[PDB]
Symmetry: C6
Subunit: 223 residues, 6 copies
């Protein structure tokens, strides 16, 4: 017997748990292949940018390195945040206020990127968490049909009870196929987002160190 052969011999209820769980599995692997390529390219880009910006000895030197990073560059967004804060604060005597406002902006920015990074993880979490609930529904539906079988035939043996038990076991099998990959993929991506946020945080830390040092050397020259 084939999986399409099993589908045909199952009742309308278990046919729907099958359709719904296979569609849940198709969406799990579709999210997986699109997000895996998205993270790979983005980590490769940020790792190169982090290495190049590590050579900067001033915020101005960092802006020169990042000049040809691209409009959609994350390191260039963080540097533009620090430059916009110095431009708007042009004419202020409080250097500590510039540093505090820049760190506030960069940390909120890094958080916002982390939120964008997981637009599909919500689907992976729900699929992994509810797939066993629907498998259990098919399990109870399955055994209920075994008892309907006993009532209808007024007989209690393996053969009368087998169609309902096989149907119950099918719902558990499909439930495990949908749930296990969604749980694994959700956790791998949640770990990758956390590791990416930490790397982007190290780049924003460098933008902050360069700005803080530059302001201190300027304040020393005024004193």
């Amino acid at each position: 017997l084939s999986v399409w052969g099993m589908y045909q011999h199952a009742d309308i209820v278990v046919k729907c748990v099958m359709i719904g769980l296979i569609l849940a599995s198709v969406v799990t692997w579709a999210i997986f292949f699109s997000k895996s390529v998205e993270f790979f390219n983005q980590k490769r880009r940020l790792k190169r940018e982090q290495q190049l910006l590590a050579e900067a000895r001033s915020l101005n030197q960092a802006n020169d390195i990042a000049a040809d990073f691209g409009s959609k560059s994350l390191s260039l967004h963080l540097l533009n945040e620090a430059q916009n804060e110095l431009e708007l604060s042009e004419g202020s005597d409080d250097n500590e206020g510039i540093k505090e406002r820049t760190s506030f902006r960069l940390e909120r920015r890094v958080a916002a990127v982390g939120r964008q990074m997981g637009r599909g993880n919500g689907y992976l979490a729900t699929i992994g968490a509810i797939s066993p609930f629907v498998g259990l529904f098919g399990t109870v539906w399955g055994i209920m049909n075994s008892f309907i079988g006993i009532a209808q035939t007024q007989t209690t043996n393996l053969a009368v009870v087998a169609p309902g038990i096989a149907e119950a076991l099918l719902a558990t099998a499909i439930g495990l196929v949908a749930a296990i990959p969604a749980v694994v993929i959700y956790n791998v991506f949640a770990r990758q987002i956390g590791g990416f946020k930490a790397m982007l945080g190290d780049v924003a830390a460098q933008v902050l160190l360069l700005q803080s040092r530059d302001l201190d050397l300027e304040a020393s020259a005024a004193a």
Copy 2:
């Protein structure tokens, strides 16, 4: 057939009706308030001063959240008119904005409590119906001195149906609760970023004003 099992089933159907009713009313409330705030955040991002932010937000509407946060900062500056302590103004403004963002989040969640309880207890009220059903089938066996399972099979199948309905009421309530909980958290974070911009504009304005007075 059983009055207790009948009550479990009508209770679960009512739980499902309430789940979808909460879903349709809250979905329209979120979609509108989440889209409006994203537009307001984009427009206010262009502001170079708190006065410029008030000009952008002039035509935002009376029920605008961004306009409430800007009015909080303006009320603080008006009441503090005549104070030498600029940090005292900044601290009082951040305290006010923090507390309002929190208060809005508390209001955004109203209706999520019902979804959580429906999703969590529905399988157990379902289980109660089947335990009760099978209990009565076994009271029946004792009373009649029955030996044949075929005589109790209709009662057992009917009892197991209560667990199936329980799981059908629970699954949508769990999914809908999690979608909304994620949306509320993401909205609180966005409203948090708008309040942060109101604070940055006020803090920078006070510093530039103090620098102009010193020289």
Copy 3:
């Protein structure tokens, strides 16, 4: 009937049943008394918060709150701020007054939250142990089905039925006692948290008025 079931059951299952029904009576008694208590308190604080939102100084806030009642929570927080200013009369450190007032108000709001919680401890224990006393009844019930087999020397559906029906009854009563207690405990825990947040917002307003007043007074001297 439920009384008919009670009569046919063991002395052990009869005790588990009466203990769980009494646990359910206490759950709903706590529920009706605390629901009215929280509603009236939330209703009173929302009105007080709206009226005190109009205050432009701590003195104005004291005038608005004058007729709030002896048992008013907003009036207690305003009296905390006033007692701090009175005891600190003659101090040059305004920041010390602000710090001591915020320390007092936050500890006060915490203490009120603890006072709201009285009764929830019973709801938590009922909701948490009811499934375990239900499990005991199940184990006891199945044990009696095996005693039945030993006594009659026969394995049969009829022989084990009294033990199985008893076992199922203990699980049913356990679920009736546990489910409401768990729900009601969580509703109240959320309501206490929401009320503490509300009382915190009123304590925040008392602090803003005192902080602003001290700053404007210091500016007038300079």
Copy 4:
């Protein structure tokens, strides 16, 4: 009879005796300490200065917790006699009082470790006796080649009794552990509020003293 199973039931009965023994001793000490601290907190709430608080707390016992906290603040002021840094006195006092409140909370917890273990393992030692009992009934069936369940029903019923006793030992230990854990938490909060009052009085007194010296 079964030795391993009889050992599990005597072990569970002894576990029940120790949960009620811990319960009666602890209930007596806790009630006595909570009752005393509530009275002390009410009396010390009237104090307008640290000196006034020491006068109110004179009529308190040697084993009084409120008097220990007040003695901590006074020992800090005595040892710091001759220091210009008032902020250093305040910081050292708050450090001492918070560590003291934490240490008292830890002392209150003595015995609760036993109420946690009994309530957590009792269902599992119960389960072990059941598994062991049923295992031996099946060893018996294998060795004698029986097919009648009636022959092993007394052994199976005896084995399931070990899970029932397990649950009877666990339920009171779990409840009593949670009531005491809640009481310790509520007591720590109250002792914290008394230490907070000792700190407010000392902080205010130092500030008013510094203000009186600035304006002679």
Copy 5:
């Protein structure tokens, strides 16, 4: 009938589950007896040291009390940390920097001691975590052999399935004997390490209070006669 008698009648697979779980239980109780005595002696020493150092009115007085505490005394290590900080900082005008550097050193030291106390708990955690899996494996294997029994012997009755069921139950019983004590002992030690860290933290707090007060009184004597 006896535990060795059951071992002999069981499968080579059930024999392996049994020996692996019994060895896991031997190591659980061996760790338990060695750590319980080394923990008792250390807490007894620190409680005496805490009582004696509570009498100190200056950091110099604390060093005199702790002079004869012993080479591996924990209270003496904390006092040596404070003294080494004052010696290395000799010639510094920033007293706040001395206080900050000393608290940094003492908190890192208290953390390092807590990590040393934790030696062996890693084994208790792994035994608690893997024992239910190896017990489950024996149960699955046992029930599998009951089905092999139904297939091999033409018949399906209590006697045919009894050897497989008895084996399955044995694996669950041993699994519970290995797992439950390892989980309990791991949690008792984790609570005891936490309580010890808190007591050692109270001793380090006293070292810090004495140093902070001493520096403040010294600075006050330099400012005003």
Copy 6:
């Protein structure tokens, strides 16, 4: 069965991945651990940051203690000409703590696979069992058998898939826990070395500032 055969192959390939991480992390910890204890011991008798750089001169280019000292020296070099000593101390501690965190992250590489293999291997085993027993019941339905003996070899074979699943999971769980403990202990030691680099720099700056105030 082809489905049950695939879970065995999957479970074998899962054991291959377990041996891979077992071998990479074995070599990375034997070679990087004990070296740190030696470096920390030598750095402990330092007195000055300059003295620490002399001790660490012959530590090796790939030394972690030498990387932390180079971080403190690069901060002093880039900050040459700054009056704010507190800003140098703050920037150095920020750099070192982010560096220690980054090393901890690099050390965890592979443990994610050990955790998932150990946690998920019993479930792919369970799937094979459920699938096997399902086909035995399809067989009973198709033939109308009433004898458990004809369907016992298939059930015993299906239960074998859970046994193999547990045999694959147990080594991954053990190895994951040993490595998790080793990483944590190493992070703690590297943290203590970075703490020493910070204490030396902080003390040096304070003694330098005191020498300038009263020459």
